């Protein structure tokens, strides 16, 4: 039997390189799935973190946690994933500190202590994963003019 | 220019037509039945957005006259992301089946167009939110070489 | 019925944009299929032309014509094609003149009148074409750690 | 550096493993039976290069102890082209079938590994000629703007 | 000639980054072809104090696929004209300024380019190297 | 700092084109990291007569995906040393010269770079725009 560790490994690798997850919240933003850049600590396992601003629309609507579905595809479209879990704000200075880098620093005027800095977390309990391979159709012979 | 609705709509339809995969979920529900499906359109722009599927797809029995859905789309290179809002229903119109028929779709059905286990869904698209993936130049770092 | 005009059109479009054909000659160069940049006049129909140098190894071996098989793929691998026909030299000044452009000019010191300039032609009678689409495997649900 | 055999061999195996499609033809013949097949290798480098196929593939009945073949390969982006010379034969070794088995291959066979219409070809690769697709800068053209 | 120049504007319009001198900046042009080339920046940028009336600049541009390289020569000056700022404004430009169009840290530079040298860069198959495979 | 500089050499080693000034040229470096940066050209190139002992040059480099931009400052001079030409030689370099290593129209320039400023360019999601679809 093929154990599911291999799929979960392909998913985490893909998420760490490609990053974008389209986050849809039921009853907020018309359910529109907005793309945000995921950051994870290490190579595998959540939580999935998203750097944002305090004036982001979702922040007022999350409360203690709002259930979400994340639409993920690898760049190149070899893997699609539906990620389910809960989204909430968790602007934890220690987490910010650990995830901080020059790319994240670009998005803030004041750096780590920028009052407009907010961090969202996705606690993903499960995901559905579809591999997308190529398939060659049958060869058709044609006279060339 | 690049941010106007006409250029964005044009890029969207161009990417959708060549890349096709839309992650479709039923709006306003517990289990959205989110899954990736292959978009097809007649022509180069404009809906409806059609999806070939099996009669036993979880979504089908929930649709009726049409249910509101969100379709999460990304181009293959990740240069464009689109969230598509619209109404989804089954419209297995033989004439539409004929026009949209191609060898790729042919491959999925052993029984062909007469396959009893065939369904064609139409997404009558209302609007889309479109996000282009741009770039951010970081602060320069002067370094010595050798 | 799907008429074969559509396939032949996809092939010619792909050949005109992507250009590279891997040309294998039986009994010459160990049968190695060498990539060369194809040029065609107009959007469709052969002959398929290849700019080269007079000191190219194949030139001495072609004679009046040597049968070839061209391996072609679109950039992105959505179409594969096996092209059969005959390859020969045909350094026709009038053809050179018609196919000439700044990209071809880059490859020659003396331009059109460079004595080292040679042109090969492939008279393709037929091709076998395989479309290569994507296929989504069945979704697998996984608990995320 | 980039033109040395080790770097070129490394790029080849990397491209072959991710892109897979090789156009295989029988060397020294009238009808080469050229067709695109999916290369698989165990590990990240080194042959044999394995190809899953149907027992009714035209090549199979011609192979015997092995026949010399040429495999025309290109990376997906067209940055590398490789012409692979080697010997091709059938080696439907159950143990190899097991190791190379994956859901993509699984998809092609309704009967699975026990499918009577299953064959596994091995290309024992001897050498390859590798052509990188570089670039040529044209002569500059000074122009007025406005 | 005209086809070549069009190729340059199309690339500049989609890829935008020009190395002006010495730093990369994001170009914007109104319409498909022709200048002036506009650069949104901040008042605290080094070049502003150095430009004055308008100084001579050299720009290094390449397309994203490296299929075109261009050397742009022109006159660079500040032209923070509210009229142009309104026309050029969009949600993307708006994202760089906390204070919108009236953000006191906003500045706009216009580059009036006179000449350019454009080197196209075609793909080219390199020499075939034979390698024993293991 | 060290990681950033390595990223620049890797990009330069794979993408090669540097806009030195004003024209694009193909860089070559021996090993993974560090200079000198070598440029194969011809004796009839304009810069050769202008370099003499070695002149100060500014180079504009960008990675092929535009994920890194670099401003390179250094000393450029001719150094057509047969010893280096032999080490740097390969079938690709050989393709530019009808006369091989002894081609009288061959020249080699070395750029001794002292400093560089490197701007990384990350991808960034732009503002979402709502559009009615037809």
Coordinates of C-alpha atoms in Angstrom, one line a residue, chain D residues 22-23 36 52 58 98 102:
Chain D
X22 CA 11.5 10.4 -24.7
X23 CA 10.7 9.9 -28.4
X36 CA 6.8 9.2 -27.1
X52 CA 5.9 1.2 -18.9
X58 CA 5.1 -2.4 -32.0
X98 CA 6.7 -2.9 -7.8
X102 CA 2.9 4.8 -8.8

